[PDB]
Amino acid sequence: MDDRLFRNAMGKFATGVTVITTELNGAVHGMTANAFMSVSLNPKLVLVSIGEKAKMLEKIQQSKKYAVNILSQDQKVLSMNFAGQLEKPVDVQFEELGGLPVIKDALAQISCQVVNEVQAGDHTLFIGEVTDIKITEQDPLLFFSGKYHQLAQ
Amino acid sequence: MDDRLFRNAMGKFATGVTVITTELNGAVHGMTANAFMSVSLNPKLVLVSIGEKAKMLEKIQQSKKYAVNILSQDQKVLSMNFAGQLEKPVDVQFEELGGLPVIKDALAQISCQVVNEVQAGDHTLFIGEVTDIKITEQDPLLFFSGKYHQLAQ
Numbered sequence A, B: 001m002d003d004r005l006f007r008n009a010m011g012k013f014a015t016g017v018t019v020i021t022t023e024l025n026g027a028v029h030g031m032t033a034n035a036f037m038s039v040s041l042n043p044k045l046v047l048v049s050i051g052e053k054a055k056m057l058e059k060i061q062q063s064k065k066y067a068v069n070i071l072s073q074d075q076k077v078l079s080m081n082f083a084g085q086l087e088k089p090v091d092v093q094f095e096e097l098g099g100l101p102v103i104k105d106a107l108a109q110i111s112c113q114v115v116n117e118v119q120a121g122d123h124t125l126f127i128g129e130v131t132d133i134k135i136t137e138q139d140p141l142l143f144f145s146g147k148y149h150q151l152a153q
């Protein structure tokens, strides 16, 4: 059992792709995440998992809020941008939802207030209560086996 | 803000589909789950999220272990089965990995020991340390907007 074997295995679980956003003292910060899930119905809770070394970790710890932007099929470049994979950052179009910066034309936008924070090995889980939601009927960006994919139409 | 709006939103995050399995007195229990994610690299941690009213909850609390079986495209019937959606249960073919019952021909099989248990609203998060992994190169069953889907080929 290598780290590569584990990552390969984990990559067998297909997911959508989100960008996590928050605002700290004026500035908008974003991070590409697929470790996201729906947690609870009553109350409305959601969870995101952030690596210990990630700049986003301290940002969320201070702001105590975050939004989750589910990316559409047309937003592959944004995924790469917020994953630190482009040499030059793109000029991202933000709007607002429940007091959070959200990404324009995202498949879906979900704004949260952090209600719990749980360390789990390498990462921290931020459990958030959902305050606002915006949905569209776009097709999703998918991530599977280390590659970007689309739904069969 | 209705429960339907929240569920619709949450459905906008595409996922693979797993069956969580465990063993209590040699009886094998399974439950369909898509609230699953990779958590930590060092140590190797995974997380699953189980509803407070789910029979699986108490089973895992006792056994202190679970396997995650990621379903292939060919396993839609299994997903429906372990979701309580068929009138008559199907005869499921089990095998073994790390002392856990796993589903034969799954896309991937991941066996875990529970290392933490965190309540989060409606649900409990069982954080699991991975002991054993088996992977194949099959295509995944997908779940998105309340429907089963496939990857574009």
Ligand SMILES: Cc1cc2nc3c(=O)[nH]c(=O)nc-3n(C[C@H](O)[C@H](O)[C@H](O)COP(=O)(O)OP(=O)(O)OC[C@H]3O[C@@H](n4cnc5c(N)ncnc54)[C@H](O)[C@@H]3O)c2cc1C
Binding pocket: A017, A028, A029, A030, A031, A032, A033, A034, A035, A036, A049, A050, A051, A053, A054, A055, A056, A057, A079, A081, A082, A083, A084, A085, A086, A089, A090, A091, A092, A143
């Ligand atoms: C598909 C995929 C899924 C991933 N899932 C997760 C996961 O769930 N959990 C996890 O911890 N990591 C995940 N990662 C890795 C993570 O996205 C990167 O490690 C990321 O670079 C870490 O961001 P950071 O907070 O450390 O800050 P940085 O490394 O600085 O942020 C990454 C990039 O975002 C850009 N950026 C930030 N804010 C803005 C803005 N205001 N406008 C324009 N650009 C901006 C920056 O230019 C930078 O290049 C994933 C990566 C991929 C590709």
Ligand SMILES: Cc1cc2nc3c(=O)[nH]c(=O)nc-3n(C[C@H](O)[C@H](O)[C@H](O)COP(=O)(O)OP(=O)(O)OC[C@H]3O[C@@H](n4cnc5c(N)ncnc54)[C@H](O)[C@@H]3O)c2cc1C
Binding pocket: B017, B028, B029, B030, B031, B032, B033, B034, B035, B036, B049, B050, B051, B053, B054, B055, B056, B057, B079, B081, B082, B083, B084, B085, B086, B089, B090, B091, B092, B143
């Ligand atoms: C795609 C999708 C994703 C879901 N994700 C989640 C989630 O992540 N978290 C969550 O809590 N719920 C989730 N659910 C709901 C969950 O799958 C159902 O609520 C399930 O019925 C609850 O199982 P239970 O533990 O309460 O026991 P039951 O309701 O009794 O189990 C469901 C079915 O599994 C069958 N079964 C169990 N063991 C065996 C076996 N040994 N051999 C053959 N059949 C067996 C039973 O016949 C039963 O019909 C999801 C449902 C769907 C369709």
Ligand SMILES: NC(=O)c1ccc[n+]([C@@H]2O[C@H](COP(=O)([O-])OP(=O)(O)OC[C@H]3O[C@@H](n4cnc5c(N)ncnc54)[C@H](O)[C@@H]3O)[C@@H](O)[C@H]2O)c1
Binding pocket: A006, A007, A008, A010, A011, A012, A034, A035, A049, A050, A051, A083, A122, A145, A146, B037, B038, B039, B040, B041
């Ligand atoms: N922290 C995360 O939850 C996470 C998820 C995906 C990618 N990433 C990071 O982004 C970079 C690019 O990703 P890639 O194209 O190599 O995809 P990849 O092939 O490494 O990812 C496939 C799967 O492996 C798992 N994984 C990868 N890194 C992980 C980590 N650090 N902690 C927990 N699970 C992890 C995830 O479940 C992911 O979906 C890599 O450095 C990777 O580590 C991190």
Ligand SMILES: NC(=O)c1ccc[n+]([C@@H]2O[C@H](COP(=O)([O-])OP(=O)(O)OC[C@H]3O[C@@H](n4cnc5c(N)ncnc54)[C@H](O)[C@@H]3O)[C@@H](O)[C@H]2O)c1
Binding pocket: A037, A038, A039, A040, A041, B006, B007, B008, B010, B011, B012, B034, B035, B049, B050, B051, B122, B145, B146
């Ligand atoms: N507990 C869960 O994480 C979960 C996830 C999916 C489906 N289910 C249950 O299985 C049954 C059939 O599912 P469906 O075909 O109606 O799909 P659906 O349209 O209700 O599911 C779409 C999304 O909504 C979210 N969701 C649904 N029920 C949830 C719950 N009880 N708690 C937290 N998030 C939830 C999930 O993220 C899911 O991916 C429903 O009763 C549903 O509640 C539960």
